[PDB]
Amino acid sequence: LRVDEVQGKNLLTNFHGMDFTTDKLRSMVRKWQTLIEANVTVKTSDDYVLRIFAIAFTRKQANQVKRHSYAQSSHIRAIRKVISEILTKEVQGSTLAQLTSKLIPEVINKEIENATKDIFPLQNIHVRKVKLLKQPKFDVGALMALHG
């Protein structure tokens, strides 16, 4: 969180970043599988510039025989590209609180899931980070619209 305004044994804060714990991703990284990442620089509706990351892991199917089930090193190009075009669609819409309202039930992950499954199925995929660097202005006007 990040502080913007102060009023007298109250102060109002704003969403700055989102991060995973170290125990969570280091739980995930198993031997004999492939680690696929993605990053994208994309602007919101109101001009918050934010760079999110992405994590993608390969699962085994039912009735696999082989012990690894890797990728093909060209499907990873086919995996990074599908995530890259999806993330630019969902950003620049209906300022970041609704994007925060999508990050909390992780709706984004199912959109990654269904589209990229036709290439290669997948496992755990999450978002892993979002951080901001280009807040435009002070702007109290839109800030008090969320308050009750």
Binding site: V6, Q7, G8, N10, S45, D46, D47, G93, S94, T95, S101, K102, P105, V107, K110, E111, N114, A115, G141, A142, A145, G148
Partner: protein, 821 residues
């Protein structure tokens, strides 16, 4: 811009004219910078020199924080020290050139200099007509926001010690030579400390003064205005700050142990309104606590008390026109509705918290698909509902708010439109099963939506809340656009524009509503006066029976032009100013030859040259096949709507020429008869003329209080079949009247019955025009679509009487009086 070298100290807008322009620009040809360097060369063009002068007066201050040095008999030299007056100082003659200017005259000059600098720096739109070919000084109602009519019967000189609360003595006659100088200076100072930062700019105009007088007289003589000095009365012109005008607290000096100077001036100025208050941050501060009004702002009360304290007890300040403009706003059926400010949106926030309480319950429900997005696209979510959202006031048609429901990307969507929409409806049945299963305070039923033609299975989910609000859910998928485009590819040559109309209303309904609500509600914190402008303008459409044919969002985009395109005016800071800017622009815009291209952004993302010229070439390709505008009249295009036909199609031509015609009636009315109560009564007066027939309607039950309009709603009934008992039947009446008589008639009605249907909210009127295609005899066809009668064995002419019996029997109990031409 109404500027000249006339004496602005005599209560006028001037002091800077052609002569000071020539002295200033001739000085800028000989320096002008901070290090005395050349700002303008002799080898520049007139646009470059003019851009240098407007750029200089826009950038460099010359009143409070600087002044300019020059030499008439060596280079000009800017000095960063101001002497609290417009100062243009010569060294060879030692003359302060801008002595005829006042401080507010230079601040207004710096603001218009910055506006004109932005107009010259605009690289897309035309500003030549704005800078050089539009008289902004014709109407003070459009040039300024708040003009207060101030009467001051001062009498003669010997009455002044009884009519001026201040002293006009020796030093006043030394410095401020005439009475209009010290009077305009006094009202300027008392009004500036009275309002301050609630406004943006302020002028004091001495109405009716004269400088010409006959050769038989020594000076200018007068007897008007209850006094014998050179004016008639005092007008107070105001440019208003939108964020700081209607604040409940006029903050003064803080409170400490010992009183400072400004606190003694503060209690010395306000007195009984000067008090102490604990603010929320723990501070103790002298202030003034005021009360907003639903009929006026606070500014009339502040200038009222200030002029009635520190100038004269005999002052008569009146602005009843703006009181009538606030009194034509729909008065909400709310507690403390009278003390509600013009810029308050709390009922919208109550609908917002109701929608969030809905969204946190439904958005975490478990379904066969995870929820992709739930998008509010109701009008109340973009602050455009004509009635403010009143709990349980469902008789108003703005009650049910449109909400898109989008599920996740899935191949569960069939490739046929009936099974697709029935699949959506069965999903709404499962959501209704969870909702009635575990959300028993919420209520719900199902409704039809024939506003997309021939798509007979769109079923809206209607949820009634314990906050008194009602929503409707309609499902958007990815399978829609493919099937509708496939139907576009499938049709023969006879059926194409009707599917362009169904598809166009589809894109206007589900698709552009999301980015529409996003854009308008996003920039809604940038133009705070815009919502009463669009709601009053929709009411102006409702009184003149024009709200039905022309859609609401089109009136939003027509109405948004004075705010997003401020030139040559300023930002509108009152309902009156921007509202008459909209009516003024519709009076002086010709939709045939001129396009309307908008820029939907925040004040200083915009269009480039290539997209703008792409829109204008779409206008040329539009007017190639439609030169006179028969098929398509209004062209309102921008970034989110580059087509210009998405929210402006399906319009008959006498609706558009009737809109522009009544706009010219309104504007020429305020040109001729001036501004008072009676002309504003004529602005909302339905003429009901130039029609082929007029039908007078009355439902036998009045419904104004059930619409949430104060001249109370309590709960929704047990059987929701009784909701139709308080719902407008005349909308279905005139609805199917438009549906049957599409080819033969043009029909107009008052869509909102609780607003303009009398005192009880139960009256209506159907005005009907026969098209010029069906005025004479025609050859009888099997596809004629007209109620006719034979003049021989081959030709038929329109039988008006049978249509009249069909309208009366179609309105069996509510058609009370029937008028013809």
């Amino acid at each position: 811009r109404g500027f000249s070298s006339n004496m602005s100290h005599s209560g006028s807008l001037g002091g800077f004219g052609t002569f000071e322009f020539t002295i200033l620009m001739a000085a800028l040809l000989n320096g002008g910078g901070i290090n005395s360097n050349k700002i303008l060369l002799h080898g520049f063009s007139s646009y470059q020199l003019f851009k240098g002068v407007i750029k200089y007066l826009a950038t460099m201050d010359l009143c409070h924080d600087g002044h300019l040095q020059f030499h008439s008999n060596p280079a000009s030299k800017y000095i960063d020290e101001g002497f609290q007056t417009p100062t243009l100082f010569d060294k060879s003659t030692k003359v302060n050139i801008l002595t005829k200017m006042t401080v507010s005259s230079y601040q207004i000059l710096k603001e218009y200099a910055g506006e004109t600098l932005r107009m010259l720096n605009n690289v897309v739109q035309d500003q030549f007509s704005n800078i050089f070919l539009t008289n902004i000084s014709r109407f003070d109602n459009l040039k300024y926001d708040l003009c207060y009519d101030v009467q001051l019967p001062l009498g003669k000189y010997n009455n002044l010690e009884t009519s001026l609360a201040a002293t006009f003595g020796s030093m006043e006659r030394v410095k401020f030579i005439t009475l209009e100088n010290f009077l305009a200076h006094k009202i300027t100072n008392v009004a500036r400390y009275a309002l301050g930062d609630r406004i943006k700019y302020i002028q004091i105009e001495m109405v009716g003064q004269k400088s010409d007088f006959p050769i038989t007289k020594r000076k200018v003589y007068s007897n008007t205005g209850g006094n014998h000095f050179n004016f008639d009365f005092v007008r107070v012109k105001l440019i208003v700050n939108p964020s700081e005008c209607d604040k409940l607290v006029t903050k003064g000096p803080a409170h400490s142990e010992t009183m400072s100077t400004e606190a003694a001036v503060f209690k010395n100025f306000w007195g009984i309104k000067s008090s102490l208050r604990r603010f929320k941050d723990g501070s103790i501060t002298h202030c003034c606590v005021w009360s907003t009004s639903s009929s006026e702002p606070i500014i009339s009360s502040i200038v009222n008390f200030a002029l009635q304290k520190h100038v004269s007890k005999k002052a008569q300040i009146s602005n009843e026109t703006i009181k009538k403009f606030h009194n034509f706003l729909p008065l909400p059926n709310l507690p403390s509705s009278a003390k509600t400010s013009v810029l308050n949106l709390s009922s919208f926030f109550n609908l917002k918290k109701s929608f969030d309480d809905l969204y946190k319950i439904i958005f975490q429900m478990k379904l066969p698909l995870s929820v992709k997005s739930i998008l509010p696209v109701g009008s109340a979510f973009r602050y455009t509902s004509l009635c403010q959202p009143v709990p349980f006031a469902y008789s108003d048609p703005d009650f049910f708010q449109d909400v898109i429901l989008e599920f996740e990307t899935s191949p569960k969507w069939p490739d046929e439109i009936t099974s697709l929409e029935k699949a959506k409806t069965a999903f709404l049945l499962k959501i209704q099963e969870e909702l009635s299963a575990n959300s028993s305070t919420y209520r719900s039923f199902f409704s039809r939506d024939e506003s997309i033609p021939y798509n007979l299975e769109i079923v809206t989910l209607n949820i009634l809340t314990p906050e008194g609000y009602g929503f409707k859910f309609r499902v958007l998928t990815e399978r829609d656009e493919i099937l509708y485009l496939r139907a576009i590819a499938n049709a023969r040559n006879e059926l194409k524009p009707e599917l362009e109309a169904t598809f166009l209303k589809f894109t206007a309904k589900y698709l552009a509503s999301v980015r529409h609500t996003r854009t308008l509600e996003n920039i809604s914190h940038s133009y705070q006066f815009y919502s009463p402008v669009v709601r009053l303008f929709k009411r102006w459409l409702d009184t003149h029976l024009l709200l039905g044919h022309i859609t609401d969002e089109l009136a939003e985009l027509i109405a948004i032009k004075p705010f997003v395109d401020p030139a040559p005016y300023f930002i509108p800071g009152s309902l009156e100013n921007g509202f008459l800017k909209v009516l003024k622009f519709i009076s002086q815009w010709n939709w045939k030859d001129d396009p309307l291209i908008l820029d939907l952004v925040k004040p200083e993302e915009r269009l480039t040259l290539a997209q703008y010229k792409g829109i204008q070439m779409n206008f040329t390709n539009l007017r190639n096949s439609d030169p006179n505008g028969t098929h398509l009249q209004f062209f309102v295009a921008s970034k989110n709507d580059p087509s210009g036909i998405l929210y402006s199609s399906g319009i008959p031509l006498p609706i558009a020429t009737r809109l522009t015609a009544l706009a010219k009636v309104a504007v020429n009315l305020l040109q001729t008869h001036g501004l008072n109560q009676q002309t504003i009564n004529l602005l909302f007066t339905p003429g009901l003329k130039d029609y082929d027939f007029v039908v007078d309607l009355r439902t036998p039950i009045g419904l104004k209080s059930s619409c949430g309009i104060l001249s109370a709603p309590s709960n929704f009934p047990e059987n929701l079949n009784d909701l139709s008992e308080k719902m407008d039947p005349t909308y279905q009446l005139v609805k199917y009247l438009n549906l049957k008589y599409k080819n033969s008639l043009i029909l107009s009605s008052r869509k909102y019955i609780g607003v303009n249907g009398g005192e009880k909210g139960d009256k209506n009127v159907i005005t009907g025009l026969i098209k010029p295609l069906f005025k004479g005899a025609h050859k009888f066809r099997v596809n004629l679509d007209c109620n006719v009668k034979p003049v021989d064995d081959e030709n038929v002419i329109l039988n008006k009487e049978a249509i009249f019996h069909e309208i009366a029997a179609f309105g069996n109990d509510m058609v009370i009086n029937f008028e013809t031409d």
